[PDB]
Design a protein around this ligand. Structure first.
Ligand SMILES: COc1ccc(Nc2nc(Nc3c(C)cc(/C=C/C#N)cc3C)nc3nc[nH]c23)cc1
Lengths: 554, 412
């Protein structure tokens, strides 16, 4: 007898206020009962379950399910009720590694730890809650009562307790062998190194020697698992990684569901396939819910899809991470609020790619979007490599400086360099800080009637120029914007504009270059055409001259 | 040696706050810090039966090179029971803000000498994350009073109060205030005398068994205040007068008898913005009347400890920032202005992060609590960067303003 260390048990509790499950056992067939008894007898022989007395008032329904039309039955204990009543755990699976963060591994060994699982004992005081009953033949005897001694498959705490028990055991091995990596995925232990295969196989036998101390064996044969690994949607190769094959279906008709599947596939592909676009395909799912509803494709969406097919024509691979080299992120503007990016260390050798979509909003500008893309990539990079990459941005240094020095908000972009690849991000207009001498002064105003929706917009100027336009189906805000629009339309390349609209100023001070409102967009197009625009604000109804509510009052 | 029992608030569970991404160098710093803390028994490893979490990160304090562990206990703090003690709340020392000099000490390490109630320890769970989720996050909980936790100074109070007695009774005019891991010590001495008294207080803690060597010095007596001012000109343009009226209209929300009628009358007709308008006598007098009004303080301004303090900040450009602290709109308790060049000439966010810390410090000295900030910045930008520039052991609350306020230049 070689003494083995016991695996320390995790103290498990029910959610407060809750008692254990009391779920009635289902009536079964004599055929299934015999099968279940045989199974539960083997398990009891293995120490997984123990027969219990009649004191235990807890129950969880057990089932018998025919394995693939064979002559063999499998058992299913349904722990859904107990899982509802079982405490939350620290789940450690939250967040999977991204392959682009991994280092290349010469050798990667797979060990099966399916058996180690049953050396993890269930907390003694919790076992009672796992009670189940095999009904007896013809209900003429008391059902056989069992409870668990090991983590039941299907039980809420099993994956977290198994994982954390394995980790605690592996910990000193990992710490004292810093030239290997160990990663657990379900019933498999992946052990990788950059070692000579002799030195690597040594470490493996050493790991087995270490696990033996807890009575744990790792079959020791040859798994049907050599690179590439199919894992979480990826292909892990020795020196490269990529996503599993992306196959876009041929269809003459797409439903809501088909498009969701399509975007989902494209979103997944975008992490390594550069330039993938999804706006025109996503902007079809806007307000629906009927998954069966056959949505027609816009000509704009069929063009996006065809472009994607071309991109998906060639298999693309990302390289693994080299901490010795630098980390570089490059962004391009795609149009329609879409941005695409590549992260690399060596030119033409991407670690990964990605995209960013413009947020939900009324007005926006390219600089703001670029800033958001930067922030997103920064955060993702810190997740994946623990550092911020150096940026290559399609924006001039002078443009950025002008932007952030004059912008009302605080903003920041980490270390970056201009990359001259069109389309370049720029500022489309710049308002004056002081009134312009020699420029005509336009006093603008608008007003509308809440009931009739009838409104007026217009201006009066220092040279006696005047306009009032009557408007239908409008609001005060629309008339205030319209008034400013007219002033821009009817002025020279340099103009001073005086308004009392806090609304219009809130928008324009936000410096948008694009908007949902076509009215704001026309205003933007006018500003772009001007050489100089000074916008001044004044309080309404204070008897400020020019400020002519009167031409609008009517 | 005996743990005072602590509970959460009724119907409240512990914090389950996401750990945010950390750079490699902060992760390394924390691994080293927590490794030694675990040796010292201040923290212990925890199992998967603890589902709680509080974010953690690393900082460098003002003018040192050594990393400091900072835990964001904001959630735990608002979920931990209203800590009435035997202080019942020491009514905030109003004399602190009048002292000629105040020195700030980091006394948080004293907390580690007092054990934490066993049944509450679970709620102090935190995670040191791995890069790219490649290894399991290292999970810990506290065995002692943790720094940054509201209950720590509350509980340690009776211990602190008797450590201080020899020094306090010796120096009856020196005001000493505790907020979180910080000790605020203010006197009206000479800097060299003041500095010695602080040293006659630090060794005096090292003697009582307890980076306390660091010293952050403030001068409340000479702190920034801001009356409203109007321009003094010999020639007024239409634009100048329009801007003045806008400012007075705004000030009339704060000050009752502000008048703009005579000043508006100068703007009748539709004049060029750059045209000079001579002031009438009725206009100059009205301007003079308003100017006198803006000398008197605001009517009905009181502090209410039951209410939150609100801090707004505006970016004025050229490294300049204005701020106002209030509880009620147009009832400012404090206004100020910053221009400090603290290694952020080219970094807006760094400047803002520092402005935020300075305003919080002022607010602690004056009222004994931190204000809720309204920050002129996008959330995603602020969330990405502020931890890189953070040097305090407390963290205030903040919200984000996305619409440019008109009132910006009225504070410049
Ligand atoms: C050939 O496949 C691989 C797998 C992993 C790496 N590199 C690294 N892996 C890990 N952990 C890890 C391991 C060892 C295997 C898998 C595959 C599971 C399946 N199927 C997944 C992971 C995350 N950690 C590393 N740290 C640096 N390089 C690493 C390199 C090539």
């Amino acid at each position: 007898m070689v003494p083995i260390s016991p695996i320390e048990t995790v103290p498990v509790k029910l959610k407060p206020g809750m008692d254990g499950p009391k779920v009635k056992q289902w009536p079964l067939t004599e055929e299934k009962i015999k099968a279940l008894v045989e199974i539960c007898t083997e398990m009891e022989k293995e120490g997984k379950i123990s027969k219990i007395g009649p004191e235990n008032p807890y129950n969880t329904p057990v089932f018998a399910i025919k394995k693939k039309d064979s002559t063999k039955w499998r058992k299913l204990v349904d722990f859904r009720e107990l899982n509802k009543r079982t405490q939350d755990f620290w789940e450690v699976q939250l967040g999977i590694p991204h392959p682009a963060g991994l280092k290349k591994k010469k050798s990667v060994t797979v060990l099966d730890v399916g058996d180690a699982y049953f050396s993890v004992p269930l907390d003694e005081d919790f076992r009672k809650y796992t009670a189940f009953t095999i009904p007896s033949i013809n209900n003429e005897t008391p059902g056989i009562r069992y409870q668990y001694n090991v983590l039941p498959q299907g039980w809420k705490g099993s994956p977290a307790i198994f994982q954390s028990s394995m980790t605690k055991i592996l910990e000193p091995f990992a710490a004292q062998n810093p030239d290997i990596v160990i990663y657990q995925y379900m019933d498999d232990l992946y052990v990788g190194s950059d070692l000579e295969i002799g030195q690597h196989r040594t470490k493996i036998e050493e790991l087995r020697q270490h696990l033996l101390r807890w009575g744990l064996t790792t079959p020791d044969k040859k798994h049907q698992k050599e690179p590439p690994f199919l894992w979480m949607g990826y292909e892990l190769h020795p020196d490269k990684w990529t996503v599993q094959p992306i196959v876009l279906p041929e269809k003459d008709s797409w439903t809501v569901n088909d498009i969701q599947k399509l975007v989902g596939k494209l979103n997944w592909a975008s992490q390594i396939y550069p330039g993938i676009k999804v706006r025109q395909l996503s902007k079809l799912l806007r307000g629906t819910k009927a998954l069966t509803e056959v949505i027609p494709l816009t000509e704009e969406a069929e063009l996006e899809l065809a472009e994607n097919r071309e991109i998906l024509k060639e298999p693309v691979h990302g390289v693994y991470y080299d901490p010795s080299k630098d980390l570089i992120a490059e962004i391009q503007k795609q149009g329609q609020g879409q941005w695409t990016y590549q992260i690399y260390q060596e030119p033409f050798k991407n670690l990964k790619t990605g995209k960013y979509a413009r947020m939900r909003g009324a007005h926006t500008n390219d600089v703001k979007q670029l800033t958001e893309a930067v922030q997103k990539i920064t955060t993702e990079s810190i997740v994946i490599w623990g550092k911020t990459p150096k940026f290559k941005l399609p924006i001039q240094k002078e443009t950025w400086e002008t932007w952030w020095t004059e912008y009302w908000q605080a903003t920041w972009i980490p270390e970056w360099e201009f990359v001259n690849t069109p389309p370049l991000v720029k500022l489309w207009y710049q308002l004056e800080k002081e009134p312009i001498v020699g420029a005509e002064t336009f006093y603008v105003d608008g007003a509308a009637n809440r009931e009739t929706k009838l409104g007026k917009a217009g201006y009066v100027t220092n040279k006696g120029r005047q306009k009032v336009v009557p408007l239908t189906n409008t609001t005060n805000q629309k008339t205030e914007l319209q008034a400013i629009y007219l002033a821009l339309q009817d002025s020279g390349l340099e103009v001073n504009i005086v308004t009392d609209s806090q609304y219009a100023l809130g928008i324009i001070q936000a410096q948008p270059d694009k908007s949902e409102s076509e009215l704001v967009n026309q205003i933007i197009e006018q500003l772009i055409k001007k050489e100089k625009v000074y916008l001044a604000w004044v309080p309404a109804h204070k008897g400020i001259g020019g400020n002519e509510q009167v031409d609008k009052l009517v | 040696i005996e743990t005072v029992p602590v509970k959460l608030k009724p119907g409240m569970d512990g914090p389950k706050v996401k750990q945010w991404p950390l750079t490699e160098e902060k992760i390394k710093a924390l691994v080293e810090i927590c490794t030694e803390m675990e040796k010292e028994g201040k923290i212990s490893k925890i199992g998967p039966e603890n589902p709680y979490n509080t974010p953690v990160f690393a900082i460098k304090k003002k003018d040192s090179t050594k990393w400091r562990k900072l835990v964001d206990f904001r959630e735990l703090n608002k979920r931990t029971q209203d800590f009435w003690e035997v202080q019942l709340g020491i009514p905030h020392p109003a004399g602190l803000k009048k002292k000629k000099s105040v020195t700030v000490l980091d006394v948080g390490d004293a907390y580690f000498s007092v054990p934490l109630d066993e049944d509450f320890r679970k709620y102090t769970a935190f995670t040191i994350p791995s890069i790219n989720n490649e290894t399991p996050g290292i999970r810990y909980q506290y065995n002692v009073l943790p720094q940054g936790w509201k209950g720590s100074p509350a509980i340690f109070q009776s211990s602190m109060t008797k450590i201080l007695e020899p020094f306090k009774k010796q120096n009856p005019d020196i005001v000493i205030y505790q907020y979180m891991d910080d000790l605020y010590v203010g006197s009206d001495l000479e800097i060299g005398q003041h500095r010695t008294k602080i040293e006659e207080l630090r060794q005096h803690l090292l003697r009582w068994g307890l980076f306390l060597w660091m010293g952050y010095e403030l001068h409340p007596d000479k702190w920034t205040v801001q009356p409203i001012v109007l321009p003094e000109k010999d020639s007024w343009t239409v634009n100048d007068i329009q801007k003045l009226v806008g400012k007075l209209n705004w000030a009339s929300q704060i000050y009752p008898g502000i008048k703009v009628r005579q000043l508006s009358k100068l703007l009748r007709g539709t004049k060029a913005l750059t045209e000079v308008i001579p002031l009438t006598e009725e206009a100059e007098l009205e301007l003079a009347e308003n100017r006198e009004i803006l000398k008197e303080p605001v009517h009905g301004v009181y502090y209410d400890p039951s209410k939150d303090l609100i801090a707004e900040i505006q970016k004025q450009g050229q490294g300049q920032w204005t701020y106002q602290i209030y509880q009620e709109p147009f009832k400012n308790l404090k206004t100020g202005k910053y221009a400090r060049m603290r290694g952020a000439h080219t970094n807006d966010v760094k400047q803002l992060t520092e402005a935020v810390q300075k305003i919080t410090t002022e607010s602690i000295v004056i009222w004994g609590k931190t204000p809720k900030f309204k920050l002129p910045i996008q959330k995603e930008t602020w969330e990405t960067w502020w931890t890189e520039y953070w040097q305090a052991t407390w963290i205030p609350e903040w919200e984000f303003v996305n619409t440019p306020p008109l009132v910006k230049l009225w504070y410049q």
